[model samples]
Target chain A: AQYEDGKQYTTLEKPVAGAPQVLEFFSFFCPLCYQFEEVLHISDNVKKKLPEGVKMTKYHVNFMGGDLGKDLTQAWAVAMALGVEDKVTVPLFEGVQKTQTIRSASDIRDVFINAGIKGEEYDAAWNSFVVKSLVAQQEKAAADVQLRGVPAMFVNGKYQLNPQGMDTSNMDVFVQQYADTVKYLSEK
Target chain B: AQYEDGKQYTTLEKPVAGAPQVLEFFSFFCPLCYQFEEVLHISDNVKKKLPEGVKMTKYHVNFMGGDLGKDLTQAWAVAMALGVEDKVTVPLFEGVQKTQTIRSASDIRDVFINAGIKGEEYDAAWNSFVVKSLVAQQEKAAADVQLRGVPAMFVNGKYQLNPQGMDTSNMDVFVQQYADTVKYLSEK
Candidate 1:
């Protein structure tokens, strides 16, 4: 039953690429996303088990809100452009989902400042061509995947894992199973 | 009418990736592939027109023949591993199709030697782990695309171009039109 196509995971209408690509569509405001990052450290644990050259790429979804969702997406793009994703990702999640303080783009910029990223750095990446393109692509990707919710994990851009099929009662077992399933999908 | 999905180009059920990837399936014995390389320099012309970071990756089909096609596929992988694809590709086509001299693995090795690649380099690459993996991947890629014939061009691994819709009367116009269509797909 493990790694069964359509049962364990559904095939994406379009495979992301011929190569191994794992796309995690998450939202800053999603509670499960916050838990996935903080409580579970799913990304880091999954990477440890993944074969070399395969890594998860996280993309922010813009459907979490109208104006605020777009702002949060831009913030994620800016963090990615500045190579500060490791530093600022959880804090932004905390600021938005936990503290509930982040609202506007300026508020997102301040969250970056609290994370030790200078205001100039934040503003520059926020307005730069590279981050702008990233934001646009993220928005398109979220829409293209036709997500029913946030925190969707796609393997090879072809298979989206069905959490209901896996043993999610135990967090450790769930993480290991998820990692193995990802490895199985990556090799496919 | 022009560039319509499923008409000018069909959407691949599974998109290759979220990024830009163009995969071309060809065989050394394929006459059209030979013409595409020698008569038209289609790869060169199209790449020149493609935006940066987007390029065509060719995979040799193993089903073209049970034994000989597999040999040619390995030969292509070896050439790619040695970084001598540009030097040896046409010679290989000429050797296989025109001269009809390449029949076995040893014959493919001789072609490489004739192309000024040291016999030691060819032997090492042929036996190396890297080339083995590449050949295996090439075979998998070939099988995955599920081709009706040789010389199939897929954009982002999601859209395969339809030549019937293109203006194939004039060589210049056909090349430009093909290039433009590829550009359109890469961006999409």
Candidate 2:
């Protein structure tokens, strides 16, 4: 494996210091990411029903392609910094695709506020050094992992999920396979 | 060319014996076709500028693909049948795209009423045999043209005006070329 020098990364995935489990990677503005969220809920339910000790932590990936995609990324980081990730995630995605209308930083901030984010808190987080650094780190991690698109899920340090272009006619079975792969990785 | 045996067609070109010098080819519920209504302000300007020999005749090309695409084509025929072409043309284009939802025929008829078409005028036109025949003709014409897309422009019988990725960056030059093409075709 080739490693690049002089790049920033989150090291967001340090060894889980305890019995480790699932890490669900996602993006703020992916419609597929939203659908995958439903799958994650099911993963939670089955884990609870059987006491698998499976823990799913969401690592919100950014849509990292160009400037417009970067702006959407910035919006995600702002949510994470302010700890309003739950509130702002879906609204920010909708804002991007309301129309082909060009969405600027101010426009996205407006969506965040509309989604019940505290206005001044959103402003501070949007402009904060911590938020900016975290966004940079995610972009670097994405580049490091060679992920060209979003809605990726990872299990332990070794396994990653890519559920695309498959015969997803049976979503339950497909997602079950996804969860089963993670459980296998954790047990290993 | 291997014609599909039993496919029917009707002659709908300019210089239609005694009818006016009208010529138009379009799809029923195409977003582009609907969008063309707004852009037809340019055509309005052209109509204002042109001489007395000019007239407008529209052929509703029933070429929308997929199952619902067929339904959309029939909707265009329905409007034409009711003798509601004058009332329906702009509204049919406008109403479907007023929002991001697929449109229904009953909603389109309401659009006709809102646009000032009334009484048996609407009824007669709605159930007119001519309208049904025109829809079939348009479908056959669409097949004959081997059309890959909709809203194609045919001027006078021998020429065509197809937009090939509008030169947004060089609008003046593009407009000049368009003028030259239109003038050259009108001469013969």
Candidate 3:
């Protein structure tokens, strides 16, 4: 009952790291997550435009393999070590949300190459000691957080209730609560 | 989706109009609602202890009929209306959780009569002209709000989101937010 098979996606898809971390758990197939897309985009724009030094990253914590659970883990590892998130975040999020193509480790490596990272460098990073270690680290992190499902979020390492809830079409109060949480964490 | 046969219960089982309504839309079969029975009791206690101006009521947004839903609504309405709540409230909550009986409208009416409301009075209130009108009002209010499902609460003439969402569970946030809305609207 705790785990459903067709949910879960990459936690690394949205790179919320360092200060002002906006870690959100997401299952691509979840209706609530889809409804929440507008709020996330709006929040991202506001955070990115903030005065520098404050960092915002989103982790797509995949628990049920909506697309590729393991491959996405590898992508997260490789991206973190390479420090080239701008190269992968948008494509990865879109890929999982729309294409659902990547199924194994090889497919993940191909996406990296297609994103303009060099083929040789991508393969090397895909199997490198740092990437291997980091992937393990991320996997452990996902479990430790009790991330049973997606669209779960943490602002600066603290849990943020979907404020908007499941049927969040008109999030009058949740929007305010969430805005407060985001503004509180994103400030430099 | 709108009119679930299994879960349907008479709104006549709801409290009288102007009795400090605490109308909660609940699925008798939902585990979460069963879990929240204690909190409902706490609410009952608060309502009972409140200065003579308060009352708590329920709507068996019944999606699972049988005796489970029927018994709950009957007992709740009788006890709360007559004001010897604790004796019946706690037991009714437990009975529903255990999947105990008291299902049919007739059976439920008997439970209340056994609990001491005069049989004639219980019948009168159960089909009271005012109570029936309020039930119609409730169905209209819920439809107007475009509700998705059960365990919704309306307090003091306001439609509210119980707990944190449409499906239920985030009672604290919804209740407090409702109070704030009332306070705001009261002034305006």
Candidate 4:
């Protein structure tokens, strides 16, 4: 007994513009999300099955509530600003979740380097005004939603879908059901 | 689409004892719950369907902040302590949700009297040390759970359920589905 769309899964009170904007609110350090991404590969599965016109985005949450979450969120903003999210996303997740290698700023720096981001480029982007501004925005967004957990999906900024708690028997089942629901909601 | 038991319904990390114990976390000032109780009649429906050995309790939340939530919570505690919940419950909901007549301490006191609660008995219960202690406990319970919103349910202190976003076609559907789930979980 896991999923209820509006009550258990929250809906956005204020609807956001744009149709089929599938947003995943997640954190690299959230163990469940990490498992879903790494072990289950739910993200890639959803992308593969995404209906036309359904644009997906990932919003990193800061509920981890420490320098770790703060730093990672800022780092993600930096990656996004530099147009290197594709390059850094998996490595960041790997560094934090798999290897347990990201504990300090230096370790984080190494993760970027390991992910093929040049040291100079990383330094510049990490300290860029754009990154700082985006980080602040992300922080505010987290607070505005009062997000309690990670790996939550918001379809069209109105419906929050949690695949982890759905009636799916397995990750594959969850991806299909979640993707089907997202498609239908988009049409509506 | 409507219900996902494990995914949508959350099981508490720590389970409390006494088989079939159920808890409903709610707020009197919450307009939605008021509508649910007064219009849908889901609460009473569940009570009528409660199986043998099942025990239920309602925990009033204090998230509204300020005096309104505090006062209502205290009044509820007093009513429970005086063993007049069945008497004062509906009138309190009506006074606050239907008539908008509950604004002050005296207004709340009037609600009890209007509910057939004796004036002297109400006064004695309202100021009793037992009521005060119980109110304090309720406050602590609210804080401990970090309840973000109200009309939430916990079954056997394990499963937390809410119908706000469930995919029920209507209120009747939601009540039947929710009731059936609660019954099954209780037996489990």
Highest-lDDT candidate: 1
Task: Identify the runs in model 4 with alpha carbons over 4 angstroms from their true place.
Answer: A1-188, B1-8, B16-20
Residues B1-188, candidate 1, lDDT per residue (tens digit)? 55788766788786665423888888887756765776556788888888887766888887675798888888888888888888888778766754445667888888889889998878888889998899888866766666668788888778888766765434556667788888898898
Retained native contacts per candidate, as fractions?
Answer: 0.00, 0.00, 0.00, 0.00
Query: Candidate 3, residues A61-94: lDDT per residue as tens digits?
Result: 5453423455676677788788876677655655
Which CAPRI level is candidate 3?
A: incorrect
Sort the candidates on DockQ, descending order. Answer: 2, 3, 4, 1
The sequence of per-residue lDDT tens digits that candidate 3 reaches over residues B121-172 is 8777766656555545545555544545665555554434333322222333
lDDT of each: 0.76, 0.53, 0.50, 0.70
Model 1 chain B — which ten-residue stretch has the worst lDDT? B166-175
Two-way DockQ contest, 2 vs 4, winner:
2
Q: After the best TM-score superposition of candidate 1, give how far the Cα of residue A176 lies from its true spot, in angstroms.
A: 0.7
Q: What is the lDDT of residue B188 in candidate 2?
A: 49
A151-170: candidate 2 lDDT, tens digit per residue = 66545544554444232334
Question: 1 or 3, which is superior by TM-score?
Answer: 1
TM-score of 2: 0.44
Per-residue C-alpha lDDT of model 2 across residues B1-188, encoded as one tens digit per residue: 12121221122343223322435666544544554456434344445445557665566654342333455566667665655666666655544434412334455556666767675565676567776677677776655545555566544544456445333335444444444444444554
What lDDT is reached at residue B178 by model 3?
A: 39
Q: Give the DockQ (2 decimals) of all models.
A: 0.01, 0.04, 0.01, 0.01
Ranking by TM-score: 1, 4, 2, 3
What lDDT tens digits, residue by residue, belong to model 4 across residues A1-188? 33455533556787655433777778987755754564456667778767766677776877783788878888889877887877777777766744345777788888778878899999988888999898877666556556688877767667776553464323345557766666666565
Chain B TM, per prediction: 0.92, 0.66, 0.51, 0.86
